[PDB]
Symmetry: C3
Amino acid sequence: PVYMVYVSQDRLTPSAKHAVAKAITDAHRGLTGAQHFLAQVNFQEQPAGNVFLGGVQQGGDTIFVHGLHREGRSADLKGQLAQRIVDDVSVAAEIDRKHIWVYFGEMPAQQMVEYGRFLPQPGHEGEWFDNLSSDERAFMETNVD
Amino acid sequence: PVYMVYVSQDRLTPSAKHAVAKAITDAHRGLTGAQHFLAQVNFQEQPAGNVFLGGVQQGGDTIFVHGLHREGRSADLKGQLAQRIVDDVSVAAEIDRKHIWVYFGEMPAQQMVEYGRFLPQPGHEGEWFDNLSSDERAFMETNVD
Amino acid sequence: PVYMVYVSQDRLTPSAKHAVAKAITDAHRGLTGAQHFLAQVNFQEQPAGNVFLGGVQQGGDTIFVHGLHREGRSADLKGQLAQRIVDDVSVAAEIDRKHIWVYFGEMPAQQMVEYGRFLPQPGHEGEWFDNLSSDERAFMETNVD
């Protein structure tokens, strides 16, 4: 999946971003079994005051996670995943949960490319990996922590 | 909902951003009935020259709006709102309509979190808002302009 | 279509961006027939280090294309188009295929506005442009490369 994380500039230090990226990555691997290296976290920083709530300009304490997934999981699994993201980014970023927004959008795995390869169904995770070339396997292998 | 409003850096003064955000928020509120505070407007600024139309580099005048909504509303209603966003953004931004792009994506409410809580089905924001903790209500309430 | 393209700051020089804009715009028109000027390429730059893969922070060699489309095309065509963007951006940007991620999202044309007007169903692009205003037709026509 790809997790677009829209935050205010400076509100997360490189350590906070790294903690937030780990929290979302570990939450996703935890509840879906998709390997670590398959989860992208992409911070989009914008100066404070670019976020408006009900027409009201905001300071730098808003966090909007927009997760982009493949289709095929149950509404229940997706509920738990968004809740665990909320709780684990609140902790990792030292921000209160009311400041956190989370949207999941889904697409067919047939129109999703990661590491230049079409993604498999969530009922295909392990077999897809074993049938990748060894140069690709190794390169993905590096993006784990 | 969340509205990602993609624009050129320095195209909009703080008050024009303010005017655009209010124009989108009242629009959405006017047409769906969902409470003011529920709508987020998130301005993403990029240097001018980052937008290509038909391969042609553009100036600072493009406006893309990506509205992320809950599933459940009719096509006639959704068109009404997008047409209205083009018109009132054009005024609030003093920018010609021909520059305005508006896309609406939808997601099950069950996978959408705002202020750390899951959203109700559309048309049900009344009860949902009453069953929130009093602290969450109060925080939300202050986000009405 | 709108192609949100997420890259690190200064990874793509102005010519490099034009090259990536071109490969994306030409692959899309080349496979669906839809007129050149109707494709937006929007570059979202962020400082290097804001991309994490599997929790590991990245340098500046990551590319995420998020493609926003009208509904109505086949998985077959959507597949060929995604593969062609990977191939044509790896060449245009001078980056290994393993670094390009491409997601396609779909929306009913009826909730999509380009140049301030609703889009047609994919099987109607010719006689839709034939009912646009002079200025509109003229406007879009200048953004052909």
